[PDB]
Ligand binder design. Structure first.
Ligand SMILES: [Zn+2]
Lengths: 443, 212, 163, 54
């Protein structure tokens, strides 16, 4: 047959603090979890890798009752326990498979599980590939498999996305080591749900749990056998010997009215997911400013999250309906104190404030004018300068909105020298009145 | 073996030869706005509901830069040097007598270059640092002449600083009927100042390999 | 004394050194030239194609220590770039945004073996292929081979002998 | 061999490139704002032209 186990074969790429990148397996990773760091190009990939590692640690702690300690590699009696059930982490097996299901008759290309790599219909620019001729190696397939429970888009027919529907912002606390990283985000619950990757589909009740929530399977998936060859994959590009070229994917809807609060999610007012409203075109009620870091810094800092826990890390995936738009991440130094709610709510309205800035015309015409488009060209540079002092801005420990208003002064003069180029006297007064534009905080 | 694939690149390995850079003006941008009104052919004389709109336009003196790789073009044609020379001449004509099609049915800015300089050198360079000071117009000059003068000063400084090392540079300054010479004296700032596009294409072609 | 370090001047009207956060449509410069960016410029200087460079030329070139000094830190400007599909077959138009660094200057120092540095400096005086700054629509405004090499010391010392 | 072509071209009041809003495309150089015609706009005009088709 074909043998490929998660623990036995190297499929996790890390970098040690001595500067040596490497690819290692699961057993070596948690053996030396205090001496390396996960290194993935796409931030969502390393986020889902950390989430799966945390879920596995939660299950093993639930079945060993050992709490991990900081600066340790890992708690003892975890590697032998994972070696006890090594047959459960099976891929390309016979009857037991990991994160897979029954062989549905529908056949799809292996590139559907990867968002950045285009699939059938749409376009194929920025990634020159074709279906069924370009495949995935023995690690990128598991990369795509681990991305299922948290980054599943709505899609076309088959609207049902997953346990979070539209993927929201994912916020979590950072560290400098993998064993250290797990300590900050170690929050055991009252009940550790039920396993959802133990080879059981496990139809549960309305109330679900952590081990059944972090390992959701919104789509039935079955990977075909490897094909001999020499070409590299379309995701990481390393030449190999075997590749996977097709899969069996068919959509499945979650039961309606499920109760599940994501530990790393952000919700607006009624459980609706707070996504990233970043697009490419500037239209009415939106001026493109990039780096929507200010948007989720209210809801996450309002429900048992008003601590420091080191530094914060935001992972934001933006998409409309089925089409994916962007993925980015932001680090924030968050070793400050508490903040007043009003100023923080004003901070989490910068998109509307900047749109109101841009929509104001030059001399006053109203109707439906686009305002001054030359202001919209200088906004993404001034917002990148403000984001340098993003830790001080949130908690008002040395920064403020009125402090950030002075960044636009250096560039609005250069805009005004172009908008009112006359050397007369009324032009000077017009420039002086135009220079004074500042964003207005509204709720 | 088409010219449109070898020179420009793939339709939509096959590495091309062109290096069309962004065209950047030589002075302060002066955006202007227009308050148009969508008038109604039927008089009506009722229900006004003002149709005031806004459309932005500008006028500028652009400095445009192009590069052509001769070895890459020859490898793309695999040896047809006459075809390579013909494609270079065709691009020299086209890039001089072609304008973008954006909003030309309402503004009709069908203008022509006021001076083209063709150079041959080992290292690449762009004379964008010449217009680090925006061009200010004076009484006995216009914008075009001052831009050409700043280009002449930068070329003079470069040939005073970056020259010799067993590598002389060659210029082929052109201007319509020689109305805009590139500087005065200083060995005319380049080689022959000629006043016809066909003569410029012929001069470059006969310099490259003595082509037709 | 045999040369030790090599100096590269990167300055143009527009330039862009892309980063890993550019995944779908929005393409962003990071803040400064990267090691992978300058080691495509050096590879295109000595005429090494995309193939045959990974197995031989890249491992020797990646064994270097480089540092970038920043003057005129640059103003990020965004560009609305549309790619016309058609003019699969459809009349659709793809939209994207691309970021550029306007009015920037970077000094790169690469330190390593002497004869490798000498070969690199000999290649840069007459590059085999066209040399740009990140994207092909961005040519340099000052010559890349503008500063001479030398038997200097560690990168902080090598980033001080340029005015 | 590397042929380089430099051109100086003054244009009538027009709008040859646009953002997503409608203004002419601009850039920053030397401490002021400068009108800019993009690189991919110029390459599209040179290509697919009647001069380049004849
Ligand atoms: Zn791969």
């Amino acid at each position: 047959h074909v043998m490929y186990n998660l623990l036995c074969d190297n499929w996790v790429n890390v970098v040690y603090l001595s500067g040596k990148p490497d690819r290692i397996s699961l057993v070596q990773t948690l053996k030396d979890a205090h001496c390396l760091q996960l290194a993935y190009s796409n931030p969502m990939d390393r986020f889902t890798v950390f989430r799966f590692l945390l879920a596995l640690g939660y299950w093993c702690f639930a079945n060993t009752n050992v709490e991990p300690e900081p600066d340790k590699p890992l708690p003892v009696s975890w590697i032998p326990w994972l070696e006890e059930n090594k047959e459960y982490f099976e891929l390309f097996g016979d009857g037991k498979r990991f994160f897979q299901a029954d062989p549905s008759s529908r056949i799809r290309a292996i590139t559907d599980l990867i968002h950045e790599i285009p699939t059938a219909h749409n376009l194929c620019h920025f990634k020159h590939v074709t279906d069924y001729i370009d495949g995935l190696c023995e690690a990128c397939c598991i990369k795509g498999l681990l991305r299922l429970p948290v980054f599943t888009t709505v899609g076309g027919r088959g609207i049902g996305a997953g346990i979070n529907n539209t993927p929201p912002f994912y916020l979590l606390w950072h560290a400098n080591d993998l064993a250290g990283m797990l300590a900050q985000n170690w929050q055991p619950w009252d009940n550790m749900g039920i396993p959802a990757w133990l080879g059981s589909f496990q139809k549960e009740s309305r109330e679900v749990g952590l081990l059944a929530g972090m390992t959701w399977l919104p789509r039935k998936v079955y990977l075909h056998d490897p094909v001999p060859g020499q070409a590299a994959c379309c995701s990481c590009g390393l030449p190999s010997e075997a590749l996977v070229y097709s899969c069996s994917i068919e959509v499945e809807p979650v039961p309606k009215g499920l109760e599940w609060k994501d530990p790393h999610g952000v919700y607006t007012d009624q459980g609706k997911s707070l996504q990233s409203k970043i697009k490419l075109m500037s239209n009415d009620r939106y001026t493109f400013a990039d780096r929507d870091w200010y948007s989720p810094l209210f809801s996450y800092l309002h429900a048992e999250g008003n601590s420091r826990q080191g530094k914060l890390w935001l992972v934001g995936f933006a998409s409309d309906k089925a089409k994916s738009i962007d993925i980015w991440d932001k680090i924030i130094e968050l070793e400050g104190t508490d903040t007043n709610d009003e100023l923080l709510a004003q901070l989490a309205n910068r998109a509307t404030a900047l749109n109101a800035m841009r929509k104001k015309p030059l001399r006053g015409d109203f109707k439906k004018s686009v305002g001054t488009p030359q202001i919209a060209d200088i906004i993404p540079h001034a917002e990148n300068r403000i984001a340098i002092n993003a830790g001080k801005m949130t908690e008002n420990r040395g920064y403020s909105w009125q402090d950030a208003d002075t960044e636009y002064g250096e560039l609005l003069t250069k805009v005004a020298y172009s908008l009112e180029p006359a050397q007369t006297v009324d032009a000077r007064l017009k420039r002086g009145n135009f220079i004074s534009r500042k964003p207005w905080p509204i709720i | 073996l088409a010219p449109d694939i070898a020179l420009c690149g793939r339709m939509l390995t096959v590495e091309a030869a062109l290096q069309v850079a962004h065209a950047i003006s030589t002075h302060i941008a002066r955006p202007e706005i227009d308050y148009f009104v969508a008038a109604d052919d039927v008089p009506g004389e009722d229900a006004g509901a003002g149709h005031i709109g806004e459309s932005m336009f500008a006028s500028a003196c652009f400095y445009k830069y192009f590069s052509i790789d001769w070895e890459q073009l020859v490898k793309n044609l695999k040896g047809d040097t006459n075809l390579a020379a013909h494609t270079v001449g065709a691009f020299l004509l086209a890039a001089a007598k072609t304008n973008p099609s954006g909003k030309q049915n309402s503004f009709a800015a069908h203008n022509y270059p006021d001076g083209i300089l063709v150079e041959f050198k080992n290292s690449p360079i762009s004379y964008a640092n010449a217009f680090v000071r925006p061009v200010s117009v004076v009484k006995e000059s216009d914008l075009v002449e001052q831009s050409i003068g700043q280009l002449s000063n930068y070329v003079n400084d470069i040939r005073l600083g970056y020259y010799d090392e067993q590598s002389p540079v060659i210029g082929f300054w052109f201007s319509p009927n020689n109305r805009y010479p590139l500087g005065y004296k200083h060995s005319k700032l380049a080689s022959r100042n000629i006043g016809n596009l066909n003569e410029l294409v012929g001069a470059v072609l006969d310099y490259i390999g003595g082509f037709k | 004394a045999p040369p030790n370090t090599l100096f590269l001047r990167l300055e143009g009207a527009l330039q862009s050194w892309g980063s890993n956060e550019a995944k779908f449509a929005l393409r962003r410069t990071a803040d400064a030239p990267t090691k992978s960016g300058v080691l495509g410029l050096l590879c295109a200087a000595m005429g090494i194609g995309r193939a045959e460079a990974a197995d031989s030329w890249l491992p020797k070139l990646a064994n270097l220590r480089m540092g970038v000094r920043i003057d005129r830190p640059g103003i990020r400007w965004w560009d609305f770039h549309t790619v016309g599909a058609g003019q699969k077959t459809r009349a659709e138009t793809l939209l994207s945004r691309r970021e550029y660094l306007a009015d920037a200057s970077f000094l790169v120092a690469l330190q390593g073996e002497p004869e490798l540095v000498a070969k690199l400096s000999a290649a840069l005086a007459k590059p085999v292929w066209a040399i740009y700054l990140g994207r092909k629509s961005c040519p340099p405004s000052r010559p890349v081979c503008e500063h001479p090499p030398g038997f200097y010391n560690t990168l902080e010392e090598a980033l001080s002998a340029v005015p | 061999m590397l042929i380089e072509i430099h051109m100086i071209q003054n244009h009538s009041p027009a709008n040859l490139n646009r953002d997503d809003l409608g203004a002419p495309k601009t850039c920053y150089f030397g401490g002021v704002l400068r009108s800019r015609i993009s690189s991919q706009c110029i390459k599209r005009s040179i290509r697919t032209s009647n001069d380049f088709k004849a």
